[PDB]
Structure 1
Amino acid sequence: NPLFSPYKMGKFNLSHRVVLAPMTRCRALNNIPQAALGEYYEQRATAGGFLITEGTMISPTSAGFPHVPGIFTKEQVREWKKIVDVVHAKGAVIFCQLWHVGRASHEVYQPAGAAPISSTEKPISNRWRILMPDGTHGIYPKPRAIGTYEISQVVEDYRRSALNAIEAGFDGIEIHGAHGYLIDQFLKDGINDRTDEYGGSLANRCKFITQVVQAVVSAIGADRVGVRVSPAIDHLDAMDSNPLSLGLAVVERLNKIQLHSGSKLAYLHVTQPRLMRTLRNAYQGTFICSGGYTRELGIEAVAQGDADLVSYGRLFISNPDLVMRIKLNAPLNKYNRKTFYTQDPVVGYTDYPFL
């Protein structure tokens, strides 16, 4: 089974290619990692296995979901250290995903009830609705379009959060550049309506992700940095007129960052809703594919050279031992969407059984 051949993800020797995809679960009450997160990640950790955390706030203005963790305060660092230690005790490698939602927020999630930030002043349309802390769905508000000083300060929030992740003991970080969140609001020509140096051309639209990646690479080293993008996912009104050219432009910038720093990123992670293989073939380094994989599709992805690692989201929610079940070809257990984003520390979180 090619999912069980070892793979060297730069400094990390992985024993198998089954990755835990980043998944927001909303159990980090008041944005503080809780003991329940330790139990959840410990259950899914395996010796030589790679795990990516739920998206994690980089600043007080970065959230658009309830009870998501941050890594911008020292209290959050101290609590994440306890989770990282239990995962490392199982021999697993873990990266923290750094997540800023940009315009995909609401006054209830912002300090002082202020408008969320973005590349643009346009709101997500009412085709989409935001999950509220009480479980209802609300209306995305108009964001405020930030200037270039504020862009540079958001870049600094990613830099400081990456340093905090290393302080908590994470092996590295993943930049969340996918799914219509802040970085994608700069990348996608369906959103970015700027006329300054961060808008118009494809090159200008790629400036923000390039600067985020360069800052975290400078702070923690490229081998501790993964980057996640989704050029073909149009969630939250985040379409591009040419998804493949946008993906190849991002890949080119990643390749240039690596050549200039003299070091390779941990990986490029692309999640989908031929494009995938084209981006993989253009990127000088490790490729993680994601979206709709099953045991057989992940085996095929690695066997046919389409990816080096395969990340699983929903199946890992309900199969804590997904790695072993894939190894044994044991039947997988269903997941319950109703408890994806609830707050209970156990129900639908750590109470899915093992084999």
Structure 2
Amino acid sequence: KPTLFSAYKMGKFNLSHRVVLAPLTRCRAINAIPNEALVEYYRQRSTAGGFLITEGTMISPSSAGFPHVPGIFTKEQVEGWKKVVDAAHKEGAVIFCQLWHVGRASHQVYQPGGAAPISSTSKPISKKWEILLPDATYGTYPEPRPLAANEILEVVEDYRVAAINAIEAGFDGIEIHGAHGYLLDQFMKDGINDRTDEYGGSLENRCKFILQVVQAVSAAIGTDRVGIRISPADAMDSDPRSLGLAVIERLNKLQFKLGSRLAYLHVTQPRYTADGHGQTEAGNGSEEEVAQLMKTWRGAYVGTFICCGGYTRELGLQAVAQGDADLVAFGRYFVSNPDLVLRLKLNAPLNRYDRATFYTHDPVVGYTDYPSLDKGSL
């Protein structure tokens, strides 16, 4: 029976355990170029046969909504990534690049020529939320511009190019960021998508864009090198269950048509504890609803399932042992615990993470200077 520390065949790739580095935007890729800081950060977190997913990576100049996040749409960026990927591979890691377009979750300061961010809609994220600016202040999300159909195809092409570039850099594959209210989610979620054309209305129409992206990148680099991340549960849908199942149905159908499986489906879940980790005491209620959603979605998807969001050591063990997921990703714990895999294997204490340096730009401080367990001198 599978455990969290058991080997796994993720289609093309042999993994030695089920602990995954979740994608984590950290803003250390100064002027969008992966650098020596990123090399050491991913190297520190690499294990033999361990799966790593990079921070969200720009597919185009309009795809940014954070400062000093890496791109993979220029040769200079590809060359920077090669150094990261080579180091991870030297440690025996398998590593995927997350392809990220933020859509309306941006600001004029992030956009070429100060243009409006692009989206499904003209409606902005409400003033309830604010955006981190390059000068360490917080700003207001602006009104986005709704894409025309031909422009949506231009973005699909940007994903295709980014995937090709990822493989050129040596990445084992890519993950489509279709979660957390960013561009593709702005089309999926009926709370955001108020379009009246062929990209709006039906679940079929709302899933069109993300399916076109999956189709294009699969054609470019192979189904077995493509993972997809979603989060159906200011980005809400009136029926998260049906939305998740709608995406899953279309992925299953595409796999059956093309004759092979995608690398995986990756789904995040919300939590209801004070610190966002773990389970509430035996008898919230929204937690059981969400728990059931995750099992329903996994059950419906034909292939590898990665769960993420508030997983503890115990909940990760249970998810794999009970068959709820094949792989378990960890985000915040991996910020502060470079050797998180070893710490989980030993049930060792976990370093506290410092949220104040999640998105600062120092190559060392709060980035590569969290300690591993003392290995001593053999």
- Please, what TM-score do these two structures have when normalized by structure 2? 0.92
- Could you give the per-residue CA deviations for residues 158-201 of structure 1, whole angstroms, max 9, x where no partner exists? 00000000000000000000000000000000000000000011
**Distance in 2 (alpha carbons) for counterparts of 1:223 and 1:202:** 26
Corresponding residue of 1:269: 266
Question: What secondary structure does 1:87 align onto?
Answer: helix
Residue 348 of structure 1 corresponds to 366
Q: Is 251-260 or 94-103 further displaced after alignment?
A: 251-260
Report the Cα distance in structure 1 between the residues aligned to 2:101 and 2:20, rounded to whole angstroms.
22
- 1:97-136 equivalences under 5 Å are 97-136=98-137
3-state secondary structure, aligned to 1:142: coil
Q: Which residue of 1 aligns with 2:304?
A: 286
Residue 256 of structure 2, aligned match among 240, 259, 262:
259
* Alpha-carbon separation, structure 1, partners of 2:135 and 2:353: 22
SS of the residue corresponding to residue 220 of structure 2 reads helix
Structure 2 distance, partners of 1:82, 1:344, is 19
* CA distance, structure 2, for counterparts of residue 268 and residue 4 of structure 1: 20
User: Structure 1 residue 34: deviation in Å?
Assistant: 1.2
The alignment partner of 2:190 has SS state of coil
Which of these residues, 289, 303, 309, is aligned with residue 327 of structure 2? 309
SS for the counterpart of 2:52 is: strand
**In structure 2, how many angstroms separate the alpha carbons of the residues matched to 1:112 and 1:147?**
20
Q: Return the letter of the residue paired with 1:292.
A: G
Decide which of 239, 242, 256 is 1:242's aligned counterpart: 239
Question: Residue 352 of structure 2 aligns to a residue in which SS?
Answer: coil
Whether 2:351 is the aligned partner of 1:333: answer: yes
Distance in 1 separating the partners of 2:113 and 2:209 = 26
Match of 2:42 in 1: 41
Counterparts of 1:333 and 1:36, CA distance in 2: 20
Q: 1:323 aligns with which of 326, 334, 341?
A: 341
* In structure 1, distance between residues paired with 2:266 and 2:346: 26
- State the shift of 1:265 in Å: 0.4
Q: Match for residue 153 of structure 1? A: 154
Structural mapping, 1:74-223, within 5 Å:
74-223=75-224
Match of 2:66 in 1: 65
Cα distance in 2 between the residues matched to 1:81 and 1:259? 33
The 1-side partners of 2:227 and 2:112 are apart by 29
Deviations 1:304-331 (A, max 9, x none): 1100000000000000000000011111
Aligned-partner SS, 2:39: helix
Q: Any idea what SS the aligned residue of 1:56 has?
A: strand
CA distance in 2, matches of 1:263, 1:78: 31
Q: Within 2, Cα distance between the matches of 1:193 and 1:54?
A: 29
Amino acid at match of 2:32: N
Q: Determine helix, strand or coil for the equivalent of 1:2.
A: coil
2:4 is paired with a residue of what secondary structure?
helix
CA RMSD in angstroms, aligned pairs only:
0.6
CA distance in 2, matches of 1:227, 1:78: 25
Instruction: After superposition, give the CA deviation of every residue in 1:13-42 in whole Å (9 maximum; x if it has no partner).
Output: 000000000000000000111110000000
Structure 2 residue identity aligned to 1:135: A
Describe how 1:18-37 pairs up with structure 2 within 5 A: 18-37=19-38
- CA offsets 1:89-122 (integer angstroms, 9 cap, x no match): 0000000000000000000000000000000000
Unaligned ranges ≥5, structure 2: 271-291, 374-378
- Report the AA paired with residue 26 of structure 1: C
Deviation at 1:57, TM superposition (A): 0.2
Displacement of 1:295:
0.6
Mapped partners of 1:325, 1:91: distance in 2:
18
Q: Distance in 2 between matches of 1:260 and 1:156?
A: 22
Separation in 2 of the partners of 1:214 and 1:302? 29
- Long gaps (5+) in structure 1: none
Distance between the aligned counterparts of 1:257 and 1:53, measured in 2? 25
Q: CA deviation at 1:279?
A: 0.3
Give the Cα separation in 1 of the matches to 2:323 and 2:6.
Answer: 13
| Deviation (angstroms), 1:345 | 0.3
1:210 partner SS: helix
How many residues are matched?
A: 351
Distance in 2 (alpha carbons) for counterparts of 1:308 and 1:77: 31
Between the aligned partners of 1:272 and 1:135, the Cα distance in structure 2 is 29
Instruction: Give SS of 2:78's match.
Output: helix
The aligned amino acid for 1:201 is S
Once residues 127 and 203 of structure 1 are traced to their aligned partners in structure 2, the CA distance between those partners, rounded to angstroms, is 30
Listed one character per residue, the Cα deviations across residues 46-72 of structure 1 (whole Å, up to 9, x for unaligned) are: 000000000000000000000000000
Give 1:334 deviation, angstroms.
0.5
| TM-score, scaled to structure 1 | 0.98
